Amino acid sequence: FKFMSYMVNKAKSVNKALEEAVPLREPELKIREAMRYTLLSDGKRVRPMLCLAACELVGGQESTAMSAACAIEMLHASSLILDDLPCMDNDSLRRGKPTNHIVFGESIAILASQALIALAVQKTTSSTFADVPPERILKTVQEMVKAVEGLVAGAGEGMRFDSDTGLEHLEFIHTAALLEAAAVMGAIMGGGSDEEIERLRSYARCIGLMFQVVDDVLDKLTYPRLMGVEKSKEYAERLNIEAREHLLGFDIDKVAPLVSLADYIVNR
Amino acid sequence: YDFKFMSYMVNKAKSVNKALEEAVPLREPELKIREAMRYTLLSDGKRVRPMLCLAACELVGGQESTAMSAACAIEMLHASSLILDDLPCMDNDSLRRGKPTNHIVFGESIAILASQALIALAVQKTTSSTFADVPPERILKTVQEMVKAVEGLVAGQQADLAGTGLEHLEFIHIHKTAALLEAAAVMGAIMGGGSDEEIERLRSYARCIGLMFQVVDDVLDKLTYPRLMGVEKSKEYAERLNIEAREHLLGFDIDKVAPLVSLADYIVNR
């Protein structure tokens, strides 16, 4: 389907706004090259793509959220430069053959991740575009830095014995902030009502969660074995239903792309 | 040794510290990540940058009230970068001032997390300012000033890693050491109501005083300043810096500028 199309187009459209955000120049230069090595590899720009979406959805236009969108992907890149560190997951190679720190060193990787965190902010914060009331960018950056916090953050509590019979029901409790951010920033920039902004953050959570439920199905703690694939799957579809619910309120003519995104997730 | 100033510098420091402590409470969760940030952040300073921020507010006719979130921010960012530079990957320093560093108490994994939470909280706290008795238009200018600071730090941390009159040390120093100082001055200047020119005069002052710290410390003694110079010619650089700094303050109210002059005084009189 074309949802892939258009989906593909946004991604190409984004990839170009990205390559100009971070060009080649001497000062400083490698940090800029390290930035691109991770930032401009092939990836589904889901996060930025969702930003533009949320913007168009609330009655704005794609280019206004473009630099919000560009930053939310910058934060993404800053994070997994850091996640692939030995201190953290220590994934020697992911997607790319080597990871950033394996090519450039831990020192240079870490630095690059910071340059990228500064840059993202500068861009959303680069005052810009539609000359959206600056009162508004604030909330945008706010929500985007609010993101990096819950990103750092990323059981028990309950127990019962039926006795009818040997039941012993035990309950537990248990990220994807960049996704919510993307959604929210975009809705902000495109001129969103407080309540549309929150509808969209609810949505972003649901599809955030059903991404990894679905990916785990494709295979310490996983999402398999606990419960069941038959179970994990239904879970994911229940989420897809909720995501639809949060889309209720918006004009019917514009929710198509987010309805479709949702479905693209679980339909694998 | 000057009192009143110290009295100044101290009461001011206490105000900031109280402001910091409450900005980062010990509440769960990430308990040992709020714990890791607090360890470095709440550790005793040396709260010049926040002072300078606050001073620069008052000088351009603002209240200490207005620039406190900003003052916290810059000291947070100081912390965040400080944690990062200590990392084995980078300067590799187990101890600082007799106590041991963040990552030898919490491990590299948490240290890094703590610095990221700090740089994220730093930014947040400029924008998230009450007393919005002030237009949001130059809260934004404040934020970009903190951005530049961060690029300066990166720039500078990166140059530090390059193990005859070469003197790029000045570049290193400005970029890392002086940047936060300049950010302090300016972010405070901005919040206060300052003209774009009052601001740059402060930015220059902040830079002279920046330089002048590192020149004098080197002296009260892997290239350092007195060696490429010779012990003395460093010591006039200081006072040349010292004067230049003072020049930059000419034009201001000769009352409200007392601390910034006195600050310069203090430093070179070592």
CATH number at residue B222: 1.10.600.10
CA B142 – CA B120 distance, rounded (Å)? 15
Exposed/middle/buried for residue A150 (C-beta within 10 Å: 0-12, 13-18, 19+): middle
Helix, strand, coil % over all residues of chain B, rounded to 5: 70, 0, 25
CA B4 – CA B258 distance, rounded (Å)? 11
Please state whether the peptide bond connecting residue B29 to the residue before it is cis, i.e. omega within 30 degrees of 0: yes
Strand partners, B250: B252
CA B229 – CA B226 distance, rounded (Å)? 5
Exposed/middle/buried for residue B36 (C-beta within 10 Å: 0-12, 13-18, 19+): buried
CA A227 – CA A236 distance, rounded (Å)? 12
Q: Are B236 and B268 in contact (CB under 8 A)?
A: no
Q: In chain A, what residues touch B127 (CB-CB under 8 Å)?
A: 138, 141-142, 145
Distance from CA of B48 to the nearest CA of A (A): 23
Query: Coil, strand, or helix at residue A28?
Result: coil
Q: In 10 A of CB A225, how many CB atoms?
A: 10
Total number of domains constituting chain A: 1
Any A CB within 8 A of B13 CB = no
Residue B30: closest CA among A266, A184, A190, A152: A152
Give ∠ CA B3-B8-B12 in degrees, rounded to 5. Answer: 150
- CA atoms lying within 13 Å on the CB side of residue B105: 17
Residue of chain A whose Cα is closest to the Cα of B30: A153
Contact A117 B119 (CB under 8 A): yes
A170 φ, ψ to 5°? -115, 130
Q: In chain A, what residues touch B159 (CB-CB under 8 Å)?
A: 28
**Region at A75 (left for phi over 0; alpha for psi -120 to 50; beta for the rest):** alpha
Point out the annotated binding site of A for dimethylallyl diphosphate: 94, 175, 212, 220
B73 alpha-carbon distance from chain centroid: 10
Residue B52: closest CA among B19, B12, B88, B7: B12
Number of H helices, E strands in chain A: 11, 0
- CA atoms lying within 13 Å on the CB side of residue A193: 8
CA A223 – CA A231 distance, rounded (Å)? 10
Residue B19: closest CA among B42, B49, B46, B53: B42
CA A100 – CA A123 distance, rounded (Å)? 23
Contact A141 B127 (CB under 8 A): yes
Distance from CA of B154 to the nearest CA of A (A): 6
Enter the tokens of residue A55. 């913007």
CA A39 – CA A132 distance, rounded (Å)? 27
Q: Are B84 and B90 in contact (CB under 8 A)?
A: yes
Q: In 10 A of CB A62, how many CB atoms?
A: 17
Q: Are B215 and B238 in contact (CB under 8 A)?
A: yes
Q: In 10 A of CB B266, how many CB atoms?
A: 17
Exposed/middle/buried for residue B246 (C-beta within 10 Å: 0-12, 13-18, 19+): middle
Write out the E strands in B85-139. 95-96, 99-100
Any B CB within 8 A of A118 CB = yes
CA B125 – CA B50 distance, rounded (Å)? 13
Any B CB within 8 A of A154 CB = no
| Residue B175 per-residue DSSP state | I
End-to-end Cα, chain A, rounded Å: 13
Rounded (10°) angle between helices A106-125 and A30-39: 80
Amino acid present at B181: L
Taking the CA atoms of A13, A17, A22 and A23 in sequence, report the sign of the dihedral they define: positive
CA A238 – CA A254 distance, rounded (Å)? 23
Taking the CA atoms of A67, A69, A75 and A78 in sequence, report the sign of the dihedral they define: negative
Distance from CA of B146 to the nearest CA of A (A): 9
Q: In 10 A of CB B213, how many CB atoms?
A: 19
The data reach a resolution, in angstroms, of 3.0
Q: Are B187 and B145 in contact (CB under 8 A)?
A: yes
Residue B263 neighbours by CB under 8 Å, 6+ apart:
B5, B9, B48, B51, B52, B55, B209
Enter the tokens of residue A157. 């509590």
Domain span at residue A163? 1-268
CA B80 – CA B90 distance, rounded (Å)? 14
Q: In chain B, what residues touch A110 (CB-CB under 8 Å)?
A: 84, 87, 89-90, 112
Enter the tokens of residue A57. 């959805």
A74 alpha-carbon distance from chain centroid: 11
- CA atoms lying within 13 Å on the CB side of residue A220: 1
Residue A151: closest CA among B150, B11, B74, B113: B113
Mutate to test the interface with A, among B27, B116, B146 (most CBs of A within 10 A): B116
Write out the E strands in chain A. none
Strand partners, B96: B99
Any B CB within 8 A of A152 CB = yes
CA B64 – CA B195 distance, rounded (Å)? 18
Taking the CA atoms of A176, A178, A184 and A187 in sequence, report the sign of the dihedral they define: negative
The pairing of strands B99-100 and B95-96 is antiparallel
CA B23 – CA B17 distance, rounded (Å)? 10
Method of elucidation? X-ray
* DSSP string covering A114-160: HHHHHHHHHHHHS--TTT--HHHHHHHHHHHHHHHHHHHH-----B-
Enter the tokens of residue B73. 């921010």
Q: Are B225 and B169 in contact (CB under 8 A)?
A: yes
CA B230 – CA A64 distance, rounded (Å)? 56
Strand partners, A159: A170
CA B6 – CA A46 distance, rounded (Å)? 54
Residue B140 neighbours by CB under 8 Å, 6+ apart:
A125, A127, A134, A137, A138, B127
Task: Write down how long chain A is.
Answer: 268
Q: Are A191 and A58 in contact (CB under 8 A)?
A: yes
CA B234 – CA A47 distance, rounded (Å)? 52
Query: Which of A117, A138, A152 is the closest to B30 by Cβ?
Result: A152
CA B161 – CA A104 distance, rounded (Å)? 13
B250 φ, ψ to 5°? -55, 130
Q: In 10 A of CB A57, how many CB atoms?
A: 25
Residue B177: closest CA among B141, B213, B124: B213
B235 φ, ψ to 5°? -75, -20
Cα-based distances in Å from B85 to A2, A86, A257, B100, B176:
48, 17, 44, 14, 11
CA B194 – CA B200 distance, rounded (Å)? 10
CA A258 – CA A253 distance, rounded (Å)? 11
